[PDB]
Amino acid sequence: RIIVVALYDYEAIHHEDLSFQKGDQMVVLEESGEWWKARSLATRKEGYIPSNYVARVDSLETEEWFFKGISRKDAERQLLAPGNMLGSFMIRDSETTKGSYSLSVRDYDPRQGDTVKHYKIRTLDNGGFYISPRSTFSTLQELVDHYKKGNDGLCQKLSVPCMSSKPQKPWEKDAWEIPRESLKLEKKLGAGQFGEVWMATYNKHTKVAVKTMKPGSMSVEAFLAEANVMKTLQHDKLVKLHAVVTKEPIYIITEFMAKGSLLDFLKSDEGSKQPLPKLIDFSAQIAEGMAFIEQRNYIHRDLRAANILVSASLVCKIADFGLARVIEDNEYTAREGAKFPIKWTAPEAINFGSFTIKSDVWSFGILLMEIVTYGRIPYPGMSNPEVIRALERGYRMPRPENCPEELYNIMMRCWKNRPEERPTFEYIQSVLDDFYTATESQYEEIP
Ligand SMILES: CCOC(=O)[C@H](CC(C)C)N[C@H]1CC[C@H](n2cc(-c3ccc(Oc4ccccc4)cc3)c3c(N)ncnc32)CC1
């Protein structure tokens, strides 16, 4: 038997769904994707449940201060989000010590501003936990209640758990290739060379975005083969593909991103006021998404601020990854103008059609410049032939005002003419993740 407990709760959307409200317990036969086969005790009702709305009975996942499955970097971002207070905290699984735990606490000092401090929660051999040897606990709940009463060596006294919203409902099972009539297109968000993007409702009860490709732009079989790879590229910094309509005009259904593209955002009243540390955090988020793409031996092929999306909570998500590969070159698409932008494209991709993760790295450098200039066109004052000929002679965009030199150094490494000399996204991810926390210890060595 495998017994579980509901963390959040939500009611029916699909066929024979269950209706709990907040706190309830149940048993599950076995797992089927992310919709587990659910059996309830004090309900007599049988159905399916969202797997991300439940957790094991006597596991930490039931606790409001435990954040399962998040990274150190995402712990810092979550805690520094608006709505959290001094001493806001979470306990999470440790990244550098398997089976152990880490405490992350929101701190403030006038010198460094808003920071997050991390503490190693060590496990005792015969049960229990401690941060400092003089203060041991039987449970993590006892550790929390202790440090809620006084800092006792921590940077702050613990106040409230990090804020968190109910996660997105998992996509309906057996709903990969969906009928076009299941979608109501409600608001056109944009028009492009090869298609449009709509805000839409799926089956009357789910908000999504739909990219509607122009007729003649893709073939069903080639797109589906590629889309079946795209849908497996699941990462918090890539936009999620939910479903496709595999008939011309092909529709691509993804999660809806309230703030549009990063280009739109940086050029908006709100985005143009983001401070430089937030711009660098955007850069780190995209680099994390690209390091995942790199790890998966995939190629974006059209990386630019216009192809980064921004959530309501300012999460950057890579969009259109791989899509350029399945846009056909024929009489229909030719009428629409340039397929890829010269100013973003690595020279070997322009000259020989050699698109690799290394030509993505080049494009990422251009994107970094877009970010720090709040969406300025690359190579201002220069035509496309001028850019190509200048690059061949070692010209690179000069460092703009309000650009840290180390960020520019990353750009210059991305813009090596020889692709092999360009860094990995794994390397870029590490430098950007640790941009300001250089010359600092990873964990606080509390006495
Ligand atoms: C020049 C165009 O510029 C415009 O018109 C406007 C101008 C503004 C100022 C009005 N900006 C555009 C910017 C982009 C924006 N857009 C595009 C997508 C999307 C991207 C890829 C995708 O498919 C994928 C395919 C493969 C992999 C992953 C996803 C599905 C949806 C998307 C989304 N899911 N949620 C919100 N906005 C979203 C629409 C408006």
What are 24's two structure tokens? 């309830």
| 302 annotated active-site | yes
Asked whether the beta carbons of 256 and 207 are under 8 A apart, the reply is: yes
Q: Which of 298, 378, 394 is nearest to 342 (CA)?
A: 378
Domain-located, residue 378: yes
Beta bridge partners of residue 113, listed in sequence order: 109
Separation of alpha carbons 8 and 412, rounded Å: 47
Considering only CA atoms, which residue is closest to atom 4 of ligand 1?
Answer: 190
Q: Are residues 300 and 413 in the same domain?
A: yes
Amino acid at 395: Y
Asked if residue 443 belongs to a domain, the reply is no
E-assigned strand segments in 32-112: 35-40, 46-50, 54-56, 89-93, 101-109
Q: State which of 164, 191, 214 marks the end of a domain.
A: 164
The tokens for 341 are 């932008």
Q: What tokens were used for 4? A: 């579980």
Tokens describing residue 39: 């059996």
Determine the Cα–Cα distance for residues 62 and 320; give it in Å rounded to an integer. Answer: 36
**Helix residue ranges, H only, 129-246:** 140-149, 220-230
How many structural domains compose the chain? 4
213 CA to centre of ligand 1 in angstroms: 12
441 located within any domain? no
Mark which of 164, 187, 215 sits at the end of a domain: 164
For 355, the token pair is 């698109």
Q: Are residues 248 and 357 in the same domain?
A: no
Q: Is 193 annotated as a binding residue?
A: yes
Query: Same structural domain for residues 131 and 235?
Result: no
Whether residue 146 contacts residue 152, with contact meaning beta carbons closer than 8 Å, is answered with yes
Q: Whose CA is nearest to atom 17 of ligand 1?
A: 197
Integer CA distances (angstroms), 125 to 60, 97, 139, in order: 19, 15, 13
Gap between the Cα atoms of 26 and 42, Å rounded? 8
Sheet holding 183-191, edge to edge: 183-191, 195-202, 207-213, 251-254, 241-245
Name the residue among 382, 235, 236, 377 with its Cα closest to residue 304. 377
> What is the distance in A from the centroid of ligand 1 to the CA of 197?
6
Q: Which helix (H) or strand (E) holds 370?
A: helix 357-372
> Is 128 annotated as belonging to a binding site?
no
Q: Could you give the CA distance from residue 38 to residue 50 in angstroms, rounded to a whole number?
A: 9
Which residues make beta-bridge pairs with 286? none
User: What kind and span of H or E run contains 3?
Assistant: strand 3-6
Residue 421 CA to residue 224 CA, distance in Å, equals 34
Contact call for residues 133 and 123 (beta carbons, < 8 A): no
Helix, strand, or coil here: 262? Answer: helix
Chain-centroid distance of CA 232 in Å reads: 15
Name the 3-class secondary structure at 68.
coil
Assess if residue 440 is contained within a domain: no
Same-domain status, 80 and 129? yes
Q: Could you tell me if 320 and 205 lie in one domain?
A: no
Category of 205 on φ-ψ map: left (φ > 0), alpha (ψ -120 to 50) or beta: alpha
Decide: 56 and 79 in contact? Cβ < 8 Å.
no
d(CA 240, CA 317): 9
Strand positions, DSSP E, 94-225: 101-109, 113-123, 129-130, 136-137, 183-191, 195-202, 207-213
Integer Cα distance of 115 and 164 in angstroms? 19
Tokens describing residue 427: 């390397």
Q: Whose CA is nearest to atom 40 of ligand 1?
A: 190
CB atoms within 10 A of CB 119: 22
Q: What CATH number should be reported for the domain holding residue 134?
A: 3.30.505.10
Residue 410, classed as helix, strand or coil, is helix
> Is 231 strand, coil or helix?
coil
Q: Which is the closest atom of ligand 1 to the Cα of 211?
A: 30
- CA of residue 263 to ligand 1 center, whole Å: 11
Phi-psi region of 113 (alpha: psi -120 to 50; beta: other; left: phi over 0): left
**How far, in Å, is the centroid of ligand 1 from the Cα of 61?**
35
The boundaries of the domain holding residue 230 are 175-260
Is 211 flagged in the annotation as binding?
yes
Quick check: is 288 in a domain? yes
**Which residue, 120, 117, 64, 63, is CA-closest to 86?**
117
C-alpha 296/C-alpha 365 separation (Å) is 21
The answer to whether 4 and 41 have CB atoms below 8 angstroms apart is: no
Token representation of residue 179:
């009928």
- Residues after which the chain is discontinuous, using a C–N cutoff of 2.5 Å: none
169, part of any domain: no
| CA nearest neighbour of 61 among 21, 90, 82, 27 | 90
Query: The tokens of 106 are what?
Result: 């929101």
If asked whether residues 204 and 229 sit together in one domain, one would say yes
- Residues 86 and 114: beta-carbon distance below 8 Å: no
Q: Closest by alpha carbon to 340, among 392, 351, 248, 394?
A: 351
Distance CA 74, CA 314 (A): 13
Residues 148 and 134 sit within 8 Å (Cβ to Cβ): no
Cβ proximity of 120 and 443 under 8 Å: yes
Probe residue for ligand 1, chosen from 171, 183, 189 as the CB with the greatest number of ligand atoms within 8 Å? 189
**CATH number of the domain to which 35 belongs:** 2.30.30.40
Strand order in the sheet with 35-40: 46-50, 35-40, 25-28, 3-6, 54-56
Ligand 1 atom nearest to CA at 253: 30
* 240 labelled ligand-binding: no
In the structure encoding, which two tokens stand for residue 55, read together?
């957790």
List pocket residues of ligand 1, CB cut-off 6 Å.
189-192, 197, 209, 211, 230, 239, 241, 252, 254, 256-257, 260-261, 264, 309, 319-321, 323
CA distance 277 to 404: 10
Same domain, 277 and 404: yes
Find out whether 236 and 315 touch, Cβ atoms under 8 Å. yes
Tell the residue number behind the tokens 């090596």, with chain if given: 416
Phi, psi (rounded to 5 degrees) for 184: -110, 110
Residue 409: give its domain's CATH number.
1.10.510.10
In ligand 1, which atom is closest to the CA atom of 197?
A: 39
**Residue 410 in tokens:** 């990353």
Q: Which of 273, 292, 249, 296 is nearest to 374 (CA)?
A: 273
Listed in sequence order, the residues at least 6 apart from 14 whose beta carbon sits closer than 8 Å to its beta carbon are 48, 172, 173
Contact 319, 254 (CB under 8 A): yes
If phi > 0 it is left, if psi is from -120 to 50 it is alpha, else beta; for residue 71 that is: beta
Which one from 302, 320, 360, 433 is the annotated catalytic residue? 302
Distances (CA, A) of 231 to 43, 166, 199, 323: 36, 23, 20, 12
69, containing H or E segment: none
DSSP β-bridge partners for residue 201: 184, 207
Question: Is 225 found in the same domain as 135?
Answer: no
Q: Alpha-carbon distance 250 to 243, whole Å? A: 11
In a domain, residue 389? The reply is yes
DSSP per residue over 350-362, as a string? HHH----HHHHHH
Q: Which phi and psi angles does 343 have, rounded to 5°?
A: -70, -15
Q: Are 154 and 71 part of one and the same domain?
A: yes
Spell 349-362 as b/e; 16+ CB within 10 A means b: bbeeeebbbbbbbb
Instruction: Note whether 400 and 381 are same-domain residues.
Output: yes
Residues 418 and 308 in one domain: yes
Tokens for 287, please give them: 């680099």
Ligand 1 centroid to 257 CA: how many Å? Answer: 8
Q: Whose CA is nearest to atom 36 of ligand 1?
A: 257
Measure 395 CA to ligand 1 centroid, in angstroms: 32
Enumerate the H helices of 182-326 as residue ranges: 220-230, 262-266, 276-295
Tokens at 262, concatenated: 């990063």
**Which of 62, 80, 106 is the C-terminal boundary of a domain?**
62
For residues 55 and 61, the answer to whether their CB atoms sit within 8 Å is yes
Cis amide linkage into residue 50, ω under 30° from 0: no
Same domain, 213 and 248: yes
Neighbouring C-beta atoms of residue 383, cutoff 10 Å: 11
On whether residue 360 sits in a domain, the answer given is: yes
